[PDB]
């Protein structure tokens, strides 16, 4: 059994995982208590009794999010021991969650994930859900992810860090958190799927067409994204691409591992009636210049490779025809080294939606994953923001007073700068 586990940390990630597991239970027909009136073997750990506990440990320095899932219907699904709490969060400080608080907390989660790995027949990887600007999403996760590489590393850790919103930085110190976490993630990051909240807002305005969508609505979009992403493992399909193949398919370079997610059927129910939900139309939708989950210009970005998690009533034959036209599209640009990265994880399992789910339920779906150099500009602006703040040493006192060092800040800066050079070098 190709069983895999997921971990959740920070305000962003615990709710993300909750919505993700909502769809997982929806397609596994499992109740919040954990009974299914198979496909959950990889995720929901069916015990001796009728209890399918999904492999998901939710650990945050702030216990409020653990309390929210405890009050959440999936209180039974989310094993209470898997729900690791804390006292103070990590502020907006990677150093706080990397050298003072999360530094000892990771060990407790290490026991949780390693015991889950013992129960697991064949661990595939780690679905870490978090943000970049988040203090716990930065230091705690970066130390947790790097410790996972120390513990195993062989497992295809599928990093899922929410890209920090550029237009509005929820944290004024988001740049530091983002660059510092990548400084301690890029080296151990097997394949980091990237999603920006602002891009989801734009999708909820151009496709979902929701005037007032809460974060739960963003999590619902991510829920469908990860449902299609792991659909290959949970459900058989024409071509099942797992986390191991995801790494080979998405990341072609040891440092170049930041593909942006993309869901074709993110249109509203009315838009679903407006469209014919054609395989070709949704292929174009998942390759539209404004479906990238990160604030980047895909047309100007060379795509290392695109992984389409096609699912539902779709055949690779129609996908090949549709993607062939997209390959000819001049707007779609791939790196000269790999200009034919059109590998598609075609599956024959129709995507379900949570009752009341914002995303329209479509008979077919495709989770396009494009590792493009367009995100180099996004990494550049993140580095630039950190540079101007670090230039006059702003908020550095907090980090250094939490185990950070100005030398490490400079290392993070050159690491990100070198990553941009790697991106453009892959493009040309």
């Amino acid at each position: 059994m190709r069983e895999c586990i997921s971990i959740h940390v920070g305000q962003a990630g615990v709710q993300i995982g909750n919505a993700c597991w909502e769809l997982y239970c929806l397609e596994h027909g499992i109740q919040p208590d954990g009974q299914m009136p198979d496909s959950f073997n990889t995720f929901f750990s069916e015990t001796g009794a009728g209890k399918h506990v999904p492999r998901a440990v939710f650990v945050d320095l702030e216990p409020t999010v653990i309390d929210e899932v405890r009050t959440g219907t999936y209180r039974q699904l989310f094993h209470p021991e898997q729900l690791i709490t804390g006292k103070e969060d990590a502020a907006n400080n990677y150093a706080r969650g990397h050298y003072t608080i999360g530094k000892e907390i990771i060990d407790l989660v290490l026991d949780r994930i390693r015991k889950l790995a013992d129960q697991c027949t064949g661990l595939q990887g780690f679905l870490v859900f978090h943000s970049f600007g988040g203090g716990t999403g930065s230091g705690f996760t970066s130390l947790l992810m790097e410790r996972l590489s120390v513990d195993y590393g062989k497992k295809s850790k599928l990093e899922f860090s929410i890209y920090p919103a550029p237009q509005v930085s929820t944290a004024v110190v988001e740049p530091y958190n983002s660059i510092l976490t990548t400084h301690t993630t890029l080296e151990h990051s097997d394949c980091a799927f990237m999603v920006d909240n602002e891009a989801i807002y734009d999708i909820c305005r151009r496709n979902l067409d929701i005037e007032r969508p809460t974060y739960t609505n963003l999590n619902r979009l991510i829920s469908q994204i990860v449902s299609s992403i792991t659909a290959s493992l949970r459900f058989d399909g024409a071509l099942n691409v797992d986390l191991t193949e995801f790494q080979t398919n998405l990341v072609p370079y040891p440092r170049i591992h930041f593909p942006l997610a993309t869901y074709a059927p993110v249109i509203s129910a009315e838009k679903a009636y407006h469209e014919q939900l054609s395989v070709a139309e949704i292929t174009n939708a998942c390759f539209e210049p404004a479906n990238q989950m990160v604030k980047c210009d895909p047309r100007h970005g060379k795509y290392m490779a695109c992984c389409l998690l096609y699912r539902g009533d779709v055949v690779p034959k129609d996908v090949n025809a549709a993607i062939a036209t997209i390959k000819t599209k001049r707007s779609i640009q791939f790196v000269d080294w790999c200009p034919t990265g059109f590998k598609v994880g075609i599956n024959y399992q129709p995507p379900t939606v949570v009752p009341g789910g914002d995303l329209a339920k479509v008979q077919r779906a495709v989770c396009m994953l494009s590792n493009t150099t367009a995100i180099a500009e996004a990494w550049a602006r993140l580095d630039h923001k950190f540079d101007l703040m670090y230039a006059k040493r702003a908020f550095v006192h907090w980090y250094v007073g939490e185990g950070m060092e100005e030398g490490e800040f400079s290392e993070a800066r050159e690491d990100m700068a070198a990553l941009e050079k790697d991106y453009e070098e892959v493009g040309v």
Binding site: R96, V168, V172, M389
Partner: protein
């Protein structure tokens, strides 16, 4: 559970704290007796961070009431929600500092701060985890200002990690009720900025005009001023004590509002400021609420933002609102108030939506800005100080209490230093 302990100093501090705990009890449905009669069990979710349960639903407010004249506390006994305190907490003196900071710091104030520290620390280990100290007092009188500084020194040395969210009423620019307040406030803020990390500027005439004109009040009784500051004070921590989509705490804002150690004074605020019956002439909504929260008319001190720049802002938005509309609103204010905005630090905002709104009020926010507009306030205070210092105007009261003009000169120098920092970073 990251509890917080409350300190009261001076009659202003005691009265504002009284109304503050009344407001909190309203929030958590706490009877004046101490027994819980609210309906939302979520009121008991973090009730421990303020109300330590004693016995049978009787929750002791975690309050320390300190003064050198018994009259205020006697009123507290007579006043409702006074008997709700455990009477052991009312640790007070008899003579009175007499609006003399030196008296409040070496005379009766010394003995009482010495006498209460034991009680407050006992309450401290009575709690599980601690965050900080609110020295709810004022700089108007020598007592609360002095003993508070004596206490803050003891509080800081014994609990340096704790972040002291002390609230103070800055001496009015026009209403100099205390003739020696230039000397007093200055002596206080010397030691404060030496130790503290977050103060506030509240002007009696500022709230006077606010209630007169924005609120349409005719009798600005101190009750209104106490209620206004108490409401803002509650909103500061509602993110901590209550769940929300994006939860913050004292630590978040503590590490977010201070680019530098010393530069740690802030201007608070709240919204909306609807009048007695203005419900018709506008329609209550979060756009208009944001619109009228960031204007100088909705400030808190006489510090006009028309002479300073918002270095950082920490808007909380207690309730349920739209992350988008706040994003575009901060965008718009950044565009229009870029002049009154630190260009050196971009992307400065701390949206921290907290789900539960205030009582009977659907929508609310508490503005907290580190605007570089205090330097004029410190300038006028330093001017008053030096004007009363050229002739040592009524210096005999202080010098006679075993004190020297040495510290007066040093405090004036440090206040000049704060002015220098504010102007230097506002310009640069």
């Amino acid at each position: 559970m990251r509890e917080i302990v409350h300190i009261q100093a001076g009659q202003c501090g005691n009265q504002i704290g009284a109304k503050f705990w009344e407001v909190i009890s309203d929030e958590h449905g706490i009877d004046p007796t101490g027994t819980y009669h609210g309906d939302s069990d979520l009121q008991l979710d973090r009730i421990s961070v303020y109300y330590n349960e004693a016995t049978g639903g009787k929750y002791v407010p975690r309050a320390i009431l300190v003064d050198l004249e018994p009259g205020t506390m006697d009123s507290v006994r007579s006043g409702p929600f006074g008997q709700i305190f455990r009477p052991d907490n009312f640790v007070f003196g008899q003579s009175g500092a007499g609006n003399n900071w030196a008296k409040g710091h070496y005379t009766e104030g010394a003995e009482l701060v010495d006498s209460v520290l034991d009680v407050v620390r006992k309450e401290a280990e009575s709690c599980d985890c601690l965050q900080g100290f609110q020295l709810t007092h004022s700089l108007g009188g020598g007592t609360g200002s002095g003993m508070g500084t004596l206490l803050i020194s003891k509080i800081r040395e014994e609990y340096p990690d704790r972040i002291m969210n002390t609230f103070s009423v800055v001496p009015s620019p026009k209403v100099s009720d205390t003739v020696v307040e230039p000397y007093n406030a200055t002596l206080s803020v010397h030691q404060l900025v030496e130790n503290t990390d977050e103060t506030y500027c509240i002007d009696n005439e500022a709230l006077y005009d606010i209630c007169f004109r924005t609120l349409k009040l005719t009798t600005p009784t101190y009750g209104d001023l106490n209620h206004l500051v108490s409401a803002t004070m509650s909103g500061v921590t509602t993110c901590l004590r209550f769940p929300g989509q994006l939860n913050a705490d004292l630590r978040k804002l503590a590490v977010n509002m201070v680019p530098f150690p010393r530069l740690h004074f802030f201007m608070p605020g709240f919204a909306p400021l609807t009048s007695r019956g203005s419900q018709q002439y506008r329609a209550l909504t979060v756009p208009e609420l944001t619109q009228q929260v960031f204007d100088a008319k909705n400030m808190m001190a006489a510090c006009d933002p028309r002479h300073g720049r918002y270095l950082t802002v920490a808007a909380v938005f207690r309730g349920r609102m739209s992350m988008k509309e706040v994003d575009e609103q901060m965008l718009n204010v950044q565009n229009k108030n870029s002049s009154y905005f630190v260009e050196w630090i971009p992307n400065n905002v701390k949206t921290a939506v907290c789900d539960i709104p205030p009582r009977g009020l659907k929508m609310a926010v508490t503005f907290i800005g580190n605007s570089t507009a205090i330097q004029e306030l410190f300038k006028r205070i330093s001017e008053q100080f030096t004007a009363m210092f050229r002739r040592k105007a009524f210096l005999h009261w202080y010098t006679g209490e075993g004190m020297d003009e040495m510290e007066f000169t040093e405090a004036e120098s440090n206040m000049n230093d704060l002015v220098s920092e504010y102007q230097q970073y506002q310009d640069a």
